C-alpha cells in the first residue's frame with residue numbers, strides 16, 4: 001500500500017519518518033543531525049531554512065513561484081522551514097512585490113504551502129514584519145537601492161518610522177509614527193497572527209532585524225523619540241516587548257515564538273561617534289526576552305545605517321550568537337546564520353569547536369542550538385542531504401528520491 | 407519596474423534571458439552551454455531533465471507534489487524538462503499512483519505545471535507511454551518487484567502485452583493484445599496527444615524503452631506474434647511506426663517529436679541463446695525513424711527481460727548512442743543518458759572527447775547532441791548551475807536567486 005499522508009486535502013505518499021531524519025541516532029551522531037525540542041515541537045535536525053524574500057508576490061499574495069521555491073526545499077528536509085518577511089500592513093512591504101498578510105485571502109494562499117509542508121511531515125514557520133523607513137523600494141535585482149515611485153507601485157506618503165530620519169538619500173524620508181500609528185501597527189500585528197494560525201503555521205518569528213521597523217525602534221541611531229518609546233534602553237525596546245506580549249497572548253502556549261535580532265548596527269568603531277545598537281544591548285535584550293516567552297534568538301546583524309562597517313566572512317555573525325548565548329544560557333535557544341558554508345563548520349558552531357566562527361581545525365567552546373542557512377539552499381535545495389553525506393550521517397530522504405540510489 | 411512574465415494567468419517576474427543561458431556565448435563556450443535548435447524551438451543549453459516517475463499521482467492526476475518537484479528544477483534552467491511517463495490508458499500505468507492522460511481533467515492539472523514552466527521562459531515536454539506487461543505493480547520503495555493486487559488498486563485481469571509471456575514470476579501474466587486492443591491503444595494515444603497539446607507542452611516524447619509496451623513489441627524475446635505485428639524486424643517495429651505516423655499527423659510540424667529507445671535488451675551474451683533486441687536493431691530503427699518525423703533519439707537500454715546482463719558505470723549507455731549517431735548522422739539528433747556525473751564528462755560526450763563513455767583524460771570522436779540527467783537533478787535541483795561553475799561558464803539564473811551572490 002502506498003500509504004497516504006494524513007490531514008491534507010490531496011493524496012501524497014506518507015514520509016515516515018520525515019526527510020532529514022537521522023536513521024541511526026546514537027551518541028556519535030553529529031549534533032547537527034540530533035533532534036531539538038522547542039515547546040510542543042521536535043525538529044528532526046538543526047538546519048533551518050532561513051527566510052528569503054522572493055519579491056514575486058501579487059498584492060502580497062503567494063503564487064506558484066512560491067510553491068516551487070519553498071516546496072522544493074521543504075521536501076528535502078530542513079529541520080524547520082521559515083517563510084519570508086511578511087508585512088502585517090500594505091505600507092510595511094519592502095517592495096510592491098513583497099509577501100503580505102493584511103488580507104484573509106493572503107492567508108489562504110499561504111495555507112497551500114503549509115499543507116504541502118505538513119503532507120511531508122515537515123515544520124514551517126512565518127516571519128512577520130514591517131519595513132518601517134526602508135519600505136517602498138524596488139526589487140534589488142532592478143537596483144541595489146532605488147525607490148518605488150508612486151507610478152511604479154510605491155507609496156512615498158505612507159512610509160513610516162520611529163523618527164523622521166531617512167536611512168539614506170536613496171530612500172524615502174519617513175513620517176515619525178504617532179501614538180495612533182503605533183496602535184494601528186499593534187492591531188495589524190494581532191490580525192496577521194490570527195491569519196497565520198488559521199493557515200496552520202507551526203512557529204512564528206518576530207522580525208526585529210535588518211533595519212526594519214522594530215530594529216529602527218531599538219537602535220538610538222534611528223530612534224530619536226522623546227515619548228515612552230525613546231530616550232533610554234527601556235523605552236527603545238518597549239515596542240518590541242509589547243509585540244512579544246501581544247503575540248504570546250494570541251498564539252498557543254504550545255507554539256514556539258522566535259525573534260530575529262540584528263546583534264549590532266556595526267557602528268561600534270572609532271571615527272563614527274553617534275551612539276548605536278551593540279551586541280551588549282542585544283544580549284541584555286535577549287536576557288529580558290528569555291523571561292517573556294521567546295524560545296529562540298535568531299542572531300543576524302546590520303542593515304540599519306549606511307555607514308555600517310561589516311567584517312564579513314565564514315560564520316562572521318556566530319561570535320555575536322555565542323555572546324548572546326553566554327548570557328541567556330539554557331533559558332533560551334540561540335541560532336546562528338550567515339556564511340555557514342559546510343556541515344563541518346555547522347557542526348563546529350553547534351558543538352563549540354573550531355573557534356567562535358567554527359572555521360579553525362586545531363585544539364571550552366560556547367555551544368549553540370540551531371544553524372540557519374539562506375543562500376546555501378538557493379544554490380542547492382538538497383543541502384541537507386549534501387551536509388549529511390559530508391558528515392557521514394545516513395538520513396531519510398523522500399521515498400520518490402531514495403529508491404533510485406539503492 | 408518588476409516586469410511581469412507574459413502569457414500566464416498569474417504575476418511573476420520575467421526571466422530574460424531564461425535561467426541556464428550562457429551570458430557570453432563565444433567559440434570557446436563549452437558545447438554543453440551552447441544553444442540547440444530543434445524544429446521551431448531553441449534549447450538554451452544541452453542539459454535535459456530526464457523523465458522521472460514520482461508514483462505520487464491521484465487517479466493519474468498531478469498534485470502539489472509534482473509542482474514542488476518539477477517547478478523546483480525547472481526554475482533552475484534545464485535546456486528542456488521532461489515530465490514522467492504518462493499512461494494513455496488506465497491499465498497502462500506502471501502503478502496505481504502513476505501519471506495518466508486518459509481524462510481531460512488530468513490535462514488541466516498538467517497545464518498548471520507548463521504554465522509555471524512558461525512563466526520562466528523554459529521548455530517542457532511530456533513522455534507518453536503504456537506499461538504493457540509491466541503494468542499494475544507497486545511503487546518501488548514498497549518493494550522492488552511485487553504486484554498491486556486488486557484490493558491494493560491493481561488490475562490483474564487487464565494487463566496486456568504483444569504476447570502472453572510474463573516478464574517474471576513476480577509480475578502478472580499479460581493477455582496478448584487482439585487487433586481490437588491495438589486499435590484501442592492507437593485511439594487512446596491520439597486522444598492523449600490532443601490533451602497534451604491543449605495543456606501546452608512544447609515537445610512530445612514516445613516511450614519505446616524500459617520493457618514497456620512499445621519495447622515489448624520491438625523485441626523478439628517478448629513479441630511472439632504471427633500477425634502483421636510479429637515474426638520479422640519490419641513487423642515488430644510496425645506498431646512503433648504507426649504510433650509515429652499518428653503523432654506527426656496530430657501535432658504541429660513546428661513541434662519536436664522525441665523517441666526514447668532501449669538500445670539493447672542486454673541479452674547479447676554467450677550462455678543466453680534466445681534472439682533479442684540489439685544495438686544494431688536500434689540503429690536500423692533509428693535510420694527508419696529519421697525519415698518519418700522523429701527529431702531526437704533518446705538512448706537508454708534494458709529492463710525488458712529479467713536475465714539481462716548490464717555493464718553499468720559512468721556513461722555506460724553513451725556507446726550505444728554514439729553507434730546510433732554514426733548511422734543517422736545529421737538526419738536526427740541523439741541524446742545520451744545514464745550516470746553522466748559531471749559537466750566535464752557531459753562536455754566530453756557532446757564534443758566527442760574522452761572516449762565512448764567520455765571518462766578518459768588523454769589523446770576523431772562521435773559527437774552527440776544532448777545530455778540527459780535524472781538522479782543528478784533529484785540530489786541537486788541546481789545541477790545546471792553546479793555544472794556551469796565546474797566548467798567556468800557564466801550563466802543567467804533566476805533574478806530571485808542571483809542578486810544574493812553579487
Ligand SMILES: Cc1cc2nc3c(=O)[nH]c(=O)nc-3n(C[C@H](O)[C@H](O)[C@H](O)COP(=O)(O)O)c2cc1C
Nearest residue numbers: 050051052053084085337338339373374375376810
Ligand atoms: C534573496 C534573499 C532574501 C532574504 N530575505 C530575508 C528575509 O525575508 N528576512 C530575513 O530576515 N532575512 C532575509 N535574508 C537574509 C538571509 O536570511 C540570511 O540571514 C543571510 O542571507 C545570511 O545567510 P546566508 O549566508 O546563509 O545566506 C535574505 C537573503 C537573501 C539572499
Ligand SMILES: Cc1cc2nc3c(=O)[nH]c(=O)nc-3n(C[C@H](O)[C@H](O)[C@H](O)COP(=O)(O)O)c2cc1C
Nearest residue numbers: 404456457458459490491743744745779780781782
Ligand atoms: C525515480 C526514477 C524515475 C524514473 N522514471 C522514468 C520514467 O518515467 N521514464 C523514463 O523513461 N525513465 C525513467 N527513469 C530513468 C531515468 O530517466 C534515467 O534514464 C536513468 O535514471 C539513468 O539516468 P541517471 O543516471 O541520470 O539517473 C527514472 C529513474 C528514476 C531513478
